[PDB]
Design a protein around this ligand. Sequence first.
Ligand SMILES: O=C(O)Cc1cc(=O)[nH]c(=O)[nH]1
Ligand code: SF4
Lengths: 1010, 1017
Amino acid sequence: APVLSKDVADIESILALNPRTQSHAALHSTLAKKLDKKHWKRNPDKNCFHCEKLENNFDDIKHTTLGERGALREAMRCLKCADAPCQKSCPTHLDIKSFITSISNKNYYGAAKMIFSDNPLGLTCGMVCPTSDLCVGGCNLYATEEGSINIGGLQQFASEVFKAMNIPQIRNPCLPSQEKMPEAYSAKIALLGAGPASISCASFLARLGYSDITIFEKQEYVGGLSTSEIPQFRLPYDVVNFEIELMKDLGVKIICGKSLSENEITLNTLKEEGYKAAFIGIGLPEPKTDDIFQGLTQDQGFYTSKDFLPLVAKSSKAGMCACHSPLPSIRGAVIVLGAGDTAFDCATSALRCGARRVFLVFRKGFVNIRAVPEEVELAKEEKCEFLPFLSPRKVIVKGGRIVAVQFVRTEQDETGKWNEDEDQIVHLKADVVISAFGSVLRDPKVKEALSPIKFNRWDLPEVDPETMQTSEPWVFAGGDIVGMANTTVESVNDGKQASWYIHKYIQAQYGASVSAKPELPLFYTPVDLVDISVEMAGLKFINPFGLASAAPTTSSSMIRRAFEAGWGFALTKTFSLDKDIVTNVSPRIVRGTTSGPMYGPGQSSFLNIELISEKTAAYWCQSVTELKADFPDNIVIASIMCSYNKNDWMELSRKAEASGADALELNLSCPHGMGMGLACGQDPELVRNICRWVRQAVQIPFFAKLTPNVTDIVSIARAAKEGGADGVTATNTVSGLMGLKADGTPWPAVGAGKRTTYGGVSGTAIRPIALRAVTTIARALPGFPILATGGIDSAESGLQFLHSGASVLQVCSAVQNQDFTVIQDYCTGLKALLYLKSIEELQGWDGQSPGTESHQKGKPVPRIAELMGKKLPNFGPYLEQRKKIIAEEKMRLKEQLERKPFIPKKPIPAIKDVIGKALQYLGTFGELSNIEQVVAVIDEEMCINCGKCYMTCNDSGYQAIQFDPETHLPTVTDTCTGCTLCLSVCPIIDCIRMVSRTTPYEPKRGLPLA
Amino acid sequence: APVLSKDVADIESILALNPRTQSHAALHSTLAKKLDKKHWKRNPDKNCFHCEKLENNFDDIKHTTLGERGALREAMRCLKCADAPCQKSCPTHLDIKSFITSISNKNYYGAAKMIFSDNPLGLTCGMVCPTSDLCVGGCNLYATEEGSINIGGLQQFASEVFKAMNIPQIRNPCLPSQEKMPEAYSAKIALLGAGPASISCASFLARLGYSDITIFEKQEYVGGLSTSEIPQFRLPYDVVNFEIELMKDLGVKIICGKSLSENEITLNTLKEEGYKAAFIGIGLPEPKTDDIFQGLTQDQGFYTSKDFLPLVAKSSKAGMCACHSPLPSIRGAVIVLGAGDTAFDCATSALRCGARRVFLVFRKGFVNIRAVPEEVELAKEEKCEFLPFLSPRKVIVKGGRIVAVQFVRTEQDETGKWNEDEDQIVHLKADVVISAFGSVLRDPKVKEALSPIKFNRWDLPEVDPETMQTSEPWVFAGGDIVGMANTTVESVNDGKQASWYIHKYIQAQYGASVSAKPELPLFYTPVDLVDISVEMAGLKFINPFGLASAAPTTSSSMIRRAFEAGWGFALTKTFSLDKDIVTNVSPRIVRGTTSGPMYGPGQSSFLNIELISEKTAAYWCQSVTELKADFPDNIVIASIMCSYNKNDWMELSRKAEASGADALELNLSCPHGMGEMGLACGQDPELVRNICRWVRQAVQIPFFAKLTPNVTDIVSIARAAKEGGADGVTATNTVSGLMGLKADGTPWPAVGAGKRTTYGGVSGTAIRPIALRAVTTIARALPGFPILATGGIDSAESGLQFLHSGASVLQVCSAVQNQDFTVIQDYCTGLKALLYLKSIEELQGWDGQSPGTESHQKGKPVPRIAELMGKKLPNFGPYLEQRKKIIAEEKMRLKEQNAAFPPLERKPFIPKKPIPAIKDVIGKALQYLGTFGELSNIEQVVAVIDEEMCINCGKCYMTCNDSGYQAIQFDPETHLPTVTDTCTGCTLCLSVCPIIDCIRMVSRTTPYEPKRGLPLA
Ligand SMILES: O=C(O)Cc1cc(=O)[nH]c(=O)[nH]1
Ligand code: SF4
């Protein structure tokens, strides 16, 4: 008999890289280290003077782009601040707190909805907004070592998920039907330029109800700058189209080929044609030119941002123009004049055109570059060179082409003025020159078409900063054309700003007034129509979510706000008869240590030694009458508690019913009085009796709130059904101790004696318990009403309890970790969930989570043949090979889809249709098939080489994984048993997956059987 | 009767900023936004062209510095990878995975120990290592949106906490007593230069046992470059002293004032004096000079890094020079020639001296700057200007002061060669010039003192890259002097590398040989002597940690490795008689959703539908015999399980004892198929008592009953087992629960195409609150009755919590499923530290290994400036502007004082009481537990916020608003909270505050009066 407790040679070999603590310090010469360091390099080599080749490489280079996995973490990291500063720093006032809350809750739709409600170009802004100088600039978390929240990427993600769902926009469902709309709304509205400004504007105008909105775009393409100049590698043209279509869904009309200039469209022709109001949003169409570049042409090698960028655009953006154009042939040293943010897109774009080298030359110093840092960094990392303090003077042309640019040094004196020493000339070689000095409105033909609107000193139309109204009442402008906005988000806000007032004006013209306070509509989709109401025990809940008798319902005042927020129902904190008045101690509510030293938002649990309500039954019953008086459709349930005494239970239960309570909830946490547990809720007999007393006392339905601290909850659940209860609430907090300091003292620690008692654990940490409890009671007493409580904190989790047999969902800890508004997330979230169950083309998704696609850092993994199954991890020499292979592919491709909405191909389920549907899958252990075994399969393309799966299987598994010592890539061997631990600890979602075993399974007995 | 369910005017006002969802889109003009944006600005203004004044401001500017709260997050974020690449990228091979794991477990000492075991200059390296180019460069987490782990900061922190503990170093406790050490070790060893290289080297040499080690430092100060040049705002001099002292604890001797020169100290004088071996670590003492700077002097405004930096050092580093040193007066435009990393310390430092403007001028392009990025950004952000493609040619002087520097343009031709166009001259104004072209060894007096060692073509001593041995067998070199190392960490490693071989050589000279495989000692402290053994039920545990009957013990082969790792004891996966052989399904083990969508390390729980062992009792029993045969001191406990049948329980239980098992554990998870206390045996006291009786009469070795938590009263089953004869109980097993469903309603784990499942067991940290109660409750009911705790143990500290609650030994599982067997090292060194600190009087304000939290921001202490406290200036917008002004004013004030700052008094903390032993702490926490009635409701408290620590999120505000008593005011301009007198001390806010110890509960000074809503009759 070999030595059973010793690894065989084969296995000892497989464990070669498994962690083992050393007994001595390691010896490795500095030289050996140097040589070896290059193998694992993951980031840029500061000693590398080049970088891969980027010719015709328009892959997304944004550092902010996030994948689901990563979106969820950051979303969870967000503090979700009150009166958040990031929103104050956002041009369109996006409720960041809210949409980010929705994301951490996996309610992407809700998040997407919140973003587009205030920003029609949500997806685009999330990709281009210079967040560092806007929202992220005020991020509270900037005051932590970890830093500010990547608001931008988070917005990008939620919007992207939403776009993928293929849901159309729809007018507010509350608006009167088309025909019933006042005359005023049919006025002909016109917008010039299909840019952010105009797209934003027309959208809001359409939301308000206006039926005749037309946008006149000069070019053949829409989207303005977002299409004509911003790089494909920063903002995909596909995104623009997405947002444009969303607009069209509301009827907005776009007509390309029409321009605003004398002989074409003019304020007069429009007035003459019957247009009641017009929004000018053509931006700054022409490049800022300079003398020294006169006569120069593209053939020679001269461009202006306005010339260059649009060419690369049209070339790299499939769908922009019908004509597939070439990618400008830029070879040799390129010189971009200027340090504006545009200058940098030119620089980086130039490299995609084949530029050998690119120099950014500005007339000031480095510290004077006012382009957003994030933008500069891209250039700098793609190895663009910088040359400061140089002002252009001459473009030396020899042989019909440019060969050099002549500069002159600049310098800043005491007073802080800039001088140019005309003595110190400078010759810089150059094969191409691109000037990024800016854009303006010069064309007198256009300037005229705007007569007689008054122009300011900047030679731009003048508008009231608040109304966006020009000198002519029916004419408003906004965006770049006005000169205030320096961003997409700001121009979008301009269109938006203007929309309201254009509305105010048009209405006035029809002798109609508008509210005093601005009421621009929110964003709406068919999802918002889904019905999430439910009936339980004869009670009609407008929506399944409610506040559970706890902290969130300490005062009736709170419940009121709760209802105002939109909560389906609520429980009054548990109250009792005067003789049982209680008095709380302090501290009494503490955070959970169930998830480690993680402080802030999203605590995995709480523990509390708080007693019932300290407020009198008088207070509560009055409060109940009040509440039900002002909120007749919100269900109010009174939570009452009495000792084991029939008269008491009947007295109190009648009093509550008398106040108007829709129903009652019996708090069975009181002591029996003799030494099953100490509490009433633990003894079936007692439970049954208390339930009888109340049954005979009142007529309104009442439910028993069961405790989970019992050997069999189904028995007390049954005893209450036998006692007359109309349903059970499952479950109350799990008893436990939340911890001790190193000194042995507890927490909470009451009084100077630092004492405490067993408290109740609430939160996500007890969901597994409440869930079992609900699913067990649901199979034992089918149909019997269950109000679930315990770890519900999102629409998805709440759906889980519905699927487990619950009809309504109680919440507490989730609101202690946040606030009443989460209700908005819950409803919009549950709606989305049910709505998606009707979309056939989206069955590969898990709720609102699309199917995970092989990606690295959130961005997809290139499907190049020369890369697949080559075992090239993303580090060291392997990464070098990857980049080459990828560049080779781009060059090969250089040598080388209608957006329709998804229609529900089935009726949208209703709460009742989903309650308990998950029960079918539950069974005993014997009903689980042990012939249908599985094994783990790793996707090397998604793996981050941590080796976690390796270690789990090594010290908690079957040593069935090989971990290459050079590529740090894992490979599950066929000794795998499919326990599923690895998958469980993989830090990359869906990198590891369980698949059906193809070979015969044979248990490991160690020693054969007799 | 006012309207009770309506907020009164005052409260509606207090809720003004409370969140409420909007009904319509927001209307805010683009202009209004612009004006408002500057009020919340937190980060730099891309439009502002000037960084606050930094004159005489040597505060820490490192972006990596971490505080405990922050260190704990990052530590937890670390994947703690296998064969970690970051370690491979570390020149000292620091077991990063391990020390970061210890940090995440609050075991700072263990962390600190690990780091110093491989890097005697741990604290320094953690602050200066150019991680981007080293360890961090290969961090797997770089492949995530969040990015690579701040290894440097993590090391800094652990080191910093350790330094605070004031614990001395001691020689390997397993080395023979001083007098019993061979002659060889008394050899006179000498090292030149008290720099990182030498400091590391001597240290290791001293660790090996050598008793005569002396370092000859030229200057009057120690620490080398780390003292003379690296900025105080990057590396505080008192860190250097800390590490030097740690060395001295090992006997190493340092003598300043002695130099290695042809006049005084030389290889020959040393040999003649009797020194058996010498290590050269003098670095590159001289600055690289250029002709164009001939004749220029400091008075004119010229310096070389070697001239300038040491001046600012001596002036800004209290404790370096005893003498009072003037802070160089640098006014006007400064020009730093070079783009080396030193060039940048010069730029930043220059600002501290009062420079009005600083220009970094290099002869190549921006892409050609070879300084690590983190270092470059420092300058860039303090607004230093850059001027590329310029080579110096002449320095102009007028009045005897510099006033300009003449340059010539440079450029690259298509062949990649750099040319300097002598025609294009450049006049650049300048009041001061500092050349940072590098350092070298030229002084022929020194080069001579090294005769006859052979020099290579770089004009530096030549040494075997592996042995660090020069042409002369008794002489080794390392660090900068050799020319390979570019970092502190690398020079440390050189000293280290050289140490071993110096060892090998010295031994040989005494006719002794050394192991084939290098055995450099680890780092040791008195804490490592702490005794963490414990006796329970007659069994002697070498340490209380052990593997609980589960996955980590699926095969005896694993238990073996576990013992090899050092685990005190282990449980065999539960096994039964042949007739009860089981077969598992799959999937069967899944991650917990108890902590949200957090994937990777540190799972809050696991749920599993795994049955007992699939391996035969034959296998186990032989395995037990083999295990106990090889590991006599490691307790092996067999976990057995049989139906409710006396013969079986007695058969199996005897077979187990027969194999040699130290004790047995009864798995009472088999059903008792008898009608209607649930279905399992462990849920019925009668059945538990009986099974315990059967086993009591069958065997003699102690056995325990592993109680299940899924019972209405666990104490009853615990008593029933004590009555049945058991020698103790294990508490508790997994909690029954369902881990969740997908959107489609199907569960997970989902077995078969039918996607079915059953109620599984929840394990991990998510059930610790249950297991702890279970333990503390059985501990008070049956005092003295042995309890083997199990349920959420994942660190020394948590383990100590179960000892404090009455458990004597701690079982582990989920924690190893989340990691691996080596966690044991963390646990032991952790528990050690804990008990050890309990005897230190001066560290009572701490909570275990956590120092008392100090008012901070982003991990840095808050300046206690009189004109800054209670002024309500939050760290954002114009308030931040005022703060910075007030702080610069304070620095200028401090300069006008020129007060010399008293030297360093680093004295070790001595245990002023015997170090407790496990027995001395078991159950000590039980005294505080009581009923609710024993809780005083007259000793009420309220929350009090530290505005200096607050990050203005407003979470406390929202908790108290929708889950509290609307007791907090949240200013609309400073976003600073203020708890009012309406507070009841519920403590929810403190619970949700994201900043540790920002909110604290204090004794209520105003009388407490419960809110009844409506008065009583
Ligand atoms: O146990 C807890 O944590 C909270 C609680 C207190 C109480 O009196 N009743 C109840 O149902 N729950
Ligand atoms: S000692 Fe330096 S090179 Fe090594 S793990 Fe630490 S910070 Fe990285």
